[PDB]
Structure formats: structure tokens, C-alpha cells
Design an enzyme around this catalytic site. Structure first.
Site, PDB file in Angstrom:
ATOM      1  N   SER A 160      -0.430  -1.385   2.138  1.00 52.05           N
ATOM      2  CA  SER A 160       0.121  -2.713   2.336  1.00 52.05           C
ATOM      3  C   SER A 160       1.131  -3.110   1.264  1.00 52.05           C
ATOM      4  CB  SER A 160      -0.996  -3.784   2.375  1.00 52.05           C
ATOM      5  OG  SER A 160      -1.810  -3.709   1.209  1.00 52.05           O
TER       6      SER A 160
ATOM      7  N   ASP B 148      -1.584 -12.903  -2.077  1.00 50.54           N
ATOM      8  CA  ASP B 148      -2.994 -13.183  -2.355  1.00 50.54           C
ATOM      9  C   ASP B 148      -3.379 -12.434  -3.619  1.00 50.54           C
ATOM     10  OD1 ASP B 148      -3.828 -10.425  -1.650  1.00 50.54           O
ATOM     11  OD2 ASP B 148      -3.516 -11.101   0.409  1.00 50.54           O
TER      12      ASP B 148
ATOM     13  N   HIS C  93      -2.294  -8.567  -3.713  1.00 46.30           N
ATOM     14  CA  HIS C  93      -0.945  -8.169  -3.354  1.00 46.30           C
ATOM     15  C   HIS C  93       0.069  -8.881  -4.227  1.00 46.30           C
ATOM     16  CE1 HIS C  93      -3.351  -7.220   0.220  1.00 46.30           C
ATOM     17  NE2 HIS C  93      -2.470  -6.260   0.429  1.00 46.30           N
TER      18      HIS C  93
END
Ligand SMILES: *[C@@H]1O[C@H](CO)[C@@H](O[C@@H]2O[C@H](CO)[C@@H](O[C@@H]3O[C@H](CO)[C@@H](O)[C@H](O)[C@@H]3O)[C@H](O)[C@H]2NC(C)=O)[C@H](O)[C@H]1NC(C)=O
Ligand SMILES: *[C@@H]1O[C@H](CO)[C@@H](O[C@@H]2O[C@H](CO)[C@@H](O[C@@H]3O[C@H](CO)[C@@H](O)[C@H](O)[C@@H]3O)[C@H](O)[C@H]2NC(C)=O)[C@H](O)[C@H]1NC(C)=O
Ligand SMILES: *[C@@H]1O[C@H](CO)[C@@H](O[C@@H]2O[C@H](CO)[C@@H](O)[C@H](O)[C@H]2NC(C)=O)[C@H](O)[C@H]1NC(C)=O
Ligand SMILES: *[C@@H]1O[C@H](CO)[C@@H](O[C@@H]2O[C@H](CO)[C@@H](O)[C@H](O)[C@H]2NC(C)=O)[C@H](O)[C@H]1NC(C)=O
Ligand SMILES: *[C@@H]1O[C@H](CO)[C@@H](O[C@@H]2O[C@H](CO)[C@@H](O)[C@H](O)[C@H]2NC(C)=O)[C@H](O)[C@H]1NC(C)=O
Ligand SMILES: *[C@@H]1O[C@H](CO)[C@@H](O)[C@H](O)[C@H]1NC(C)=O
Ligand SMILES: *[C@@H]1O[C@H](CO)[C@@H](O)[C@H](O)[C@H]1NC(C)=O
Ligand SMILES: *[C@@H]1O[C@H](CO)[C@@H](O)[C@H](O)[C@H]1NC(C)=O
Lengths: 365, 364
Positions: A22, A306, A309
Site C-alpha cells: 500500500s 493514517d 501510512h
């Protein structure tokens, strides 16, 4: 003029690639806030949110498993994934526990990085099913978690010694497969009671030029799911069994060959401090095949999507991939120069500057 | 001014060692005429005329096998041996043929070189005979050549599963064994007919923390029964292990290379080890000595003696290469060694270590 290593990965040539998750997936709906890499380097990465190269080897898609068809080519390689199979996940299958699976993770990345140093392309492929397959009942985990899809573990309807043939292809699309990274797994610790007796657990991968196997017929009945990660040449092989249990691969990393040996680069891939991470990447990424860039701080986000990340440390490190470099080392990268302000250690590649103090003519030193 | 690497092995500090054969054995009666190294470096080498490290792992002394208790320590390491197990010897044991053993040789050196890069000391040791051995009949080669002493292959009187215990020690004299290079061998290609039926060949080395094994009971076709003697060269930690069998055939090791641990990884150096072109040589050393773990110094000429003891001792090219070991260099590479310098007359390739000059054309 003198140079100082810039701490983080880097590349010397145009021919480089990245493998990630991600934190380098520009298709993520929160991107660019969710990135740890510069957004403009997203096209250099083969990455998918919630996946890892380990996880994708063993599993296709399930509710708790995001499987990705990783694929990239580069003489120079930067890995930044791994977190999505961590102790946080609490996965285990038989009696090996979570620690068992962190060991398997470490084994896999050790072999992946090793094989990657003499390859340019790395591609996760779906193997064709063996052409002839008898009736099979799918294996299960004692924990009722999802059994790996690769290698297949299944049960034959009798105890007759059997082989089926699997094919590791010579190519996949435009990619040549000069070799394959293939898992070989089994349930250890003695015979396995099923179908009315304690049956030997004996499986193997075999050709005229290859053997790898496990056999145990020896008498709570406990077993661990154990894997080894094998270098296998393209070709047709037997997945053989002494009876009942059948193990054969359904996926592999197809790799080609280049005639240079270039260490890969891996960045520490962990969770924020409230979750359970491991050091499989640090244990797997060792000299002489891999240059490991560890984090010196926790996973700490001040301007990201968040708490897991947008790490400030790794963001600063990944800026190194935008630099002019002729030398890549665990201290980081430098452009072409005569002298380095600090000592450069191994593994390294390119043309590296020498430590300044070695040439001092003061002589205070 | 750019320096030119001196083609041949080298060393950066005093803490280096050699492993060798007749060509670095000062005890040879024809020495120093029979040497390929400078006489004054004999003390840095562990060497024995007619031996090799591969041969000595598998055999003790027999009529055409000269076994040597190889033993040396060094952060840096120069290997110049191998030739005394080559196709000239025409050795095979089962149906694997001469090439089968050239393959095993290659596997062994590959493993040796890899493990050596994180060790300082390498010592060939005898292992204690397992306690409470059962009745055993010696194995034999189908060729009736000399069966390896290591690992031991023997025949039990019965066909029931059993186990014996072997110990890989934590130390030998003052050398610490943090790991062991141990061979695991078996006879492949299906069931093996002995005692009046075709029996499974199933053997393994196992502990609480270790497993390596082989199993085959595949039936034979017609009268085509054939087996090859195959070995894998294993990294094993000190400890007690079981040599296990499903029955009849017993394999357990009787020697190993004990190695300690150093906390840096340093590539080893191997020099090509061949016969004069009167005889058959192989390229096992070149195939085993690969980046990133070994720096291979190949010969560009045949083995060529002009002032030595016989056609196979005193090669001019290797003698010139071994002069490199008479300096303390700063950079060790496949192009050879250099002192401390800014620039090199040519590209310096991998593996290399130390502080290496850079190709001068890069700076103009
Ligand atoms: C596991 O399942 C997911 C879906 O949940 C698969 O991911 C999907 O992969 C496809 C094809 O690779 C993606 O479709 C493509 O999207 C692009 C836009 O970026 C479009 O232009 C292409 O023509 C194509 O439609 C799809 O976006 C992607 N979906 C998600 C949610 O990631 C994945 O491939 C499966 N893994 C395995 C091993 O089968
Ligand atoms: C196999 O047989 C040969 C004999 O044919 C054995 O060679 C002998 O080995 C010993 C111990 O390595 C040698 O002694 C050494 O002599 C040097 C130089 O004088 C000395 O400085 C050392 O400390 C050591 O005492 C002995 O000379 C040598 N004999 C011959 C004739 O070469 C060999 O050890 C046997 N191999 C095995 C594995 O037992
Ligand atoms: C990567 O860095 C981490 C964090 O510094 C290292 O993990 C630490 O290891 C020490 C030594 O055992 C422990 O006392 C610390 O508590 C660990 N910290 C955390 C947060 O886990 C890790 O060992 C490094 N890995 C490598 C290969 O160098
Ligand atoms: C990358 O950095 C290197 C080293 O700084 C650059 O090479 C220098 O370029 C200048 C011109 O600005 C020359 O005067 C120097 O002689 C060069 N130094 C060396 C050691 O070659 C190189 O130009 C940079 N490349 C790019 C594309 O920016
Ligand atoms: C080391 O050098 C020898 C001699 O050049 C190489 O052996 C030759 O290999 C070529 C290419 O396979 C063959 O065509 C010749 O027949 C070989 N010649 C001899 C005299 O053996 C050998 O390949 C080299 N090894 C390595 C690893 O570079
Ligand atoms: C698999 O086994 C069969 C029978 O035992 C053998 O004849 C065949 O060659 C094997 N296939 C391969 C690809 O090794
Ligand atoms: C935070 O990141 C956003 C978008 O990535 C950027 O526009 C903004 O300048 C950043 N803010 C700070 C304080 O760095
Ligand atoms: C190299 O340096 C060592 C270590 O100080 C020294 O003792 C030795 O004499 C030198 N060796 C050679 C061959 O010059």
C-alpha cells in the site's frame, strides 16, 4: 568534491525496479497521502495494497488474503513490503504457531533476495494444474485458518504410491524463466493418522536431474506445516508420494538470468508500535546478496492517511531514489567522487568513493 | 597516477591462510622445485602432496587416496587445490560414472566456499563412532573401487526401522565449531534389491531442530536396476543427531569440516587447479567459485612447467600469480590486488574487498 552517503535506497542506472505494498501503490484511494515513496516513482514499483510477495506466493485471494501478481524487471531492485504477513495477522495452520510462519517468511525472503541478485525479471506465475490428477480431497489447517493454495496439499482416496507431473514453464508471456522459486511443504513430526491408520508422510519433487523430499513414518499427535523454498530449473517434474498425501506447486516466481551479480535492496517493512511486527526482512536481507536499510525510529506518521501510512523516516529514505548515484551501500548512496566523509561497508556496488581519512597527509591521523 | 591490479591472489592483513596440495607443500622431497608458491609462504598454507579437501572429506588413506587433516585459520583465504580429484583418477562407485563425481566435487567446493566466507577457522575432524552400533556389513561400490569412509554406508542384518546417534562437537582442540560441513549421501533410483527383495532406500539425519533425508521405494523395470551414489553437502550446527533409516541401509557421517564464526563476510579466493594437458582435468573449481562468495583466478594458459620438478609441478603462470601474496595490498579483486590508490588502469569487478581504486576513465 567529497560526498556523504545519503541514507536510503538508490539506483545507478535507468534499469531499476521496486516491489511493494500500500505504501507504494498509487491506485490506493488515499494516495498520495498513503505513500512512503515519491508519487512520481509509483510507475517503477510493482505494488498492491494489503499484499506481500510472501503472502502472494502461498495464497490466492480469500477474505483475509489480498493476492497480487507481482511482476517487475530491473538490474537494480528495491523491496519495500512484507508487513502484511506479520505476527499481527496471527496466522498459523498446524502446530507450528505464528513463530513457525515468521521462520517460513524469513526463509522465503532469504531465497527471493538470493535468486534476485542474478536475475533481471521476477514474475509470480500461476502454474497449470498437472494434466492428470486423481480424485483429491483438499487438506485443512488444524486452526481452521485458510490452508495455503501453494503448494497444494491434498488427500488421495487410497494409500497407493503415486506421481503427478507439474510443469515449470520456460517462459511466461515475454518473460523468460531461466529459474523458478518454488515452495516445497509438508506436515512434519511422524506418521499422520487418517483413513484408518497412521500413514507415512512422504512427498517429493523429482526429475532426472533433481530430488528434494521428506519422509516420516515414525509413531497427542502433533505436526507442523514446514516449507523450504527451492531453486528449480524450467522443466517437467514429478510431485511424488509414498501414498495418501499429495503436495505439488500451483505458483512460482519465474526469474530470468543476467550475467552480473547485483545485490538487492530492502527497506524495513513494519507496523506502527501498537501492532506486532517482525524482523524477517532484517534477518533475510544479509550480505553479500542484500543491502538492508533498517528504520531507526518507529513507524511514525505526521502527514499521512493514517498511523500506518506515511512514515517520516522512510519517506526521507526513499528520496534517495531521486538522487544522482554511482555507488549503492548500506550507508546509502553517493554520486561519483574520490572521497567519502564516512566509511562505506558491504554489500556495495557501483564505483564507490574511498574513506577520506585513508588519504590524509596531515598527519594528525 | 593509476595503478594496475597485479593478477593473482592477495591479502590485506597478516590474518590470511592457504589450503593446498603438493604445489604448496614444502615437505615434498622435490621442494622448492615442485612448488607453485614462494617457499617462504609454505608456513601460511595447510597442504599435503596428492591430497585435496574434497578427497579428504570422503576418504581416509587408501592405496590411491592421500587423505590430509586440513586445518587453517584466516580472515582471508586462498584455495589452491582440487586437482587430486579429477577425471584423470577415473573414480566412480555406483552407476553415476566419472561425471557424477565431478558433479559431487562441484557441490562440495560450492558449499565449502560459501560457509568459509563467514568463518575464520576450517578444520577437518574425525567424528566419534556412534555408541551401541548394531551389527553392520560394510557397503561396497558396484565398480569395486574404494567406498567413501565418509559418510559411512553400511548394511544392517534386518529391514526394520532404526536409528543411531552421532555427535557434531561444539569444539575440537582450541577451534570452536559453530557449524559443520557434513555430507549426506544415498543410492538413488528406486528400491534396492538385497536380502532377496527390492527394499526401500530411506535414510535421514534428524534432530529436534534439523531434517534432511531421502526416500525411494519405486519398483524397478525388468533387469534395469541401477543406482547412483549421490551426496548433498550440508550446513549443520553442533549437537547430537540421529542417523535414521527405514531399514537395511545405514548412512551416518564419520568426518566433517568444523568451522567457527567471524562477524564479517569476506569472499574467499580460489586459483584454478589442473593437470598438464597430458591428462584429463575438470572445471569444478571454476564452477564452484562464483560471485558473490568466491573470487576465481583462472589460468589463461595450460599448466606449463619450464623450471620445475615434472610436468605437473611449477607452473609459470601460477607462480607469477602467487607473487601477489608477498605484499600487503589494500584491494583484493578478480583482476588482482592493488595498494592504496586513487585510480586503477582498468575496471575492478566483483567480488572485491578492501579499499579499491576507481577506474581512471570515470574521472576523465
Ligand atoms: C485478487 O483479486 C483482486 C480483485 O479483488 C484482483 O485485483 C484486480 O486485478 C485486476 C486485473 O489485474 C484489476 O483490473 C484492472 O484495473 C485497471 C485499472 O487500474 C484497468 O484499466 C484494467 O483494464 C483492469 O480492469 C483490478 O483493478 C484489481 N482490483 C483490485 C480491487 O485490486 C487480483 O488480481 C486478484 N489476485 C489474483 C492473484 O488473482
Ligand atoms: C595418510 O598417510 C600419510 C603418510 O603417508 C600421513 O602423512 C603424515 O602426516 C603427518 C601429520 O600431518 C606428517 O607430520 C608432519 O610433519 C611436518 C613436517 O616435518 C611437521 O612440521 C608437522 O607438525 C607434522 O608432524 C607426516 O610428515 C606425514 N608423512 C608423510 C610421509 O607425508 C597422513 O597424515 C595420513 N592421513 C591421515 C588422514 O591420517
Ligand atoms: C532493525 O532495527 C530494529 C530497531 O532498532 C532492531 O530491533 C531492535 O533490536 C534490539 C536488539 O535485540 C532490541 O533490543 C530492540 O528492542 C529492538 N527494537 C524493536 C522496536 O524491535 C532490529 O534488530 C534491526 N534489525 C537488523 C537486522 O539490524
Ligand atoms: C552526477 O554527479 C556527478 C558527480 O558530481 C557529476 O559529475 C560531475 O559533473 C561536473 C559538471 O557539473 C564535472 O565538472 C565534474 O567533473 C563531474 N565529476 C565527476 C567525478 O565526474 C555528474 O554530472 C552528475 N550527473 C548528472 C546527470 O547530474
Ligand atoms: C577457465 O579457463 C579455461 C580455459 O580457458 C576454461 O575452459 C575452456 O572453456 C571453454 C568454454 O567452455 C571451452 O570451450 C574450452 O574447451 C575450455 N578449455 C580448457 C583448456 O579447458 C574454463 O571454462 C574457465 N572456467 C571458468 C569458470 O571461467
Ligand atoms: C515420473 O516417474 C515415472 C515413473 O516412476 C518416470 O518414468 C517418469 O520419467 C518421471 N517423470 C519425470 C519428469 O521425471
Ligand atoms: C502534507 O502533505 C500534503 C499532500 O501530500 C502537502 O500538500 C502538504 O504540503 C504537506 N504538509 C506539510 C506540513 O508537510
Ligand atoms: C603485512 O602486515 C602484517 C600485519 O601487521 C605484518 O606483520 C606483515 O609483516 C606484513 N606481511 C607482508 C607479506 O608484508
Amino acid at each position: 568534491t567529497p560526498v556523504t552517503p545519503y541514507y536510503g535506497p538508490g539506483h545507478i542506472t535507468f534499469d531499476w525496479c521496486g516491489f511493494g505494498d500500500s505504501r507504494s501503490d498509487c491506485t490506493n484511494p488515499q494516495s498520495p497521502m498513503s505513500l512512503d515513496i515519491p508519487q512520481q516513482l509509483c510507475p517503477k514499483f510493482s505494488s498492491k495494497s494489503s499484499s506481500s510477495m510472501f503472502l502472494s506466493l502461498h495464497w490466492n485471494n480469500h477474505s483475509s488474503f489480498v493476492s497480487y501478481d507481482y511482476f517487475n524487471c530491473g538490474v537494480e531492485k528495491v523491496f519495500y513490503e512484507g508487513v502484511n504477513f506479520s505476527p499481527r495477522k496471527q496466522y498459523s495452520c498446524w502446530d507450528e504457531g505464528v513463530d513457525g510462519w515468521i521462520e517460513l517468511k524469513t526463509r522465503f525472503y532469504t531465497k527471493l533476495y538470493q535468486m534476485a541478485t542474478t536475475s533481471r525479471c521476477i514474475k509470480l506465475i500461476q502454474l497449470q494444474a498437472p494434466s492428470s490428477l486423481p480424485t483429491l480431497q483438499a487438506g485443512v489447517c488444524r486452526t481452521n485458518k485458510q490452508l495455503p493454495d501453494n503448494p497444494r496439499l491434498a488427500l488421495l482416496s487410497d494409500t497407493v504410491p503415486t506421481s503427478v507431473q507439474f510443469v515449470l514453464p520456460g517462459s511466461s508471456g515475454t518473460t523468460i524463466c531461466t529459474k523458478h522459486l518454488v515452495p516445497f511443504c509438508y506436515l512434519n513430526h511422524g506418521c499422520f493418522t487418517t483413513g484408518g491408520s497412521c500413514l507415512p508422510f512422504g512427498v517429493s519433487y523429482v526429475s532426472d536431474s533433481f530430488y528434494y523430499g521428506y519422509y516420516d513414518a515414525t509413531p497427542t499427535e502433533s505436526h507442523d506445516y514446514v516449507c523450504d523454498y527451492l531453486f528449480m530449473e524450467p522443466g517437467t517434474y514429478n510431485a511424488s508420494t509414498v501414498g495418501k498425501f499429495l503436495v505439488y506447486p500451483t505458483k512460482s516466481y519465474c526469474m530470468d538470468t543476467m550475467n552480473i551479480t547485483v545485490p538487492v535492496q530492502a527497506v524495513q517493512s513494519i507496523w506502527s508500535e501498537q501492532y506486532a511486527s517482525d524482523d524477517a526482512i532484517g534477518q533475510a536481507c544479509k550480505a553479500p546478496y542484500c543491502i538492508f536499510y533498517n528504520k531507526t525510529t518507529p513507524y511514525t506518521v505526521t502527514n499521512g492517511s493514517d498511523a500506518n501510512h506515511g512514515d517520516d523516516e522512510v519517506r526521507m529514505m526513499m528520496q534517495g531514489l531521486l538522487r544522482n548515484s554511482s555507488c549503492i551501500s548500506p550507508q546509502g548512496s553517493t554520486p561519483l567522487a574520490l572521497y567519502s566523509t564516512e566509511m562505506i561497508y558491504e554489500p556495495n556496488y557501483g564505483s564507490c568513493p574511498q574513506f577520506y581519512k585513508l588519504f590524509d597527509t596531515s598527519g594528525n591521523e
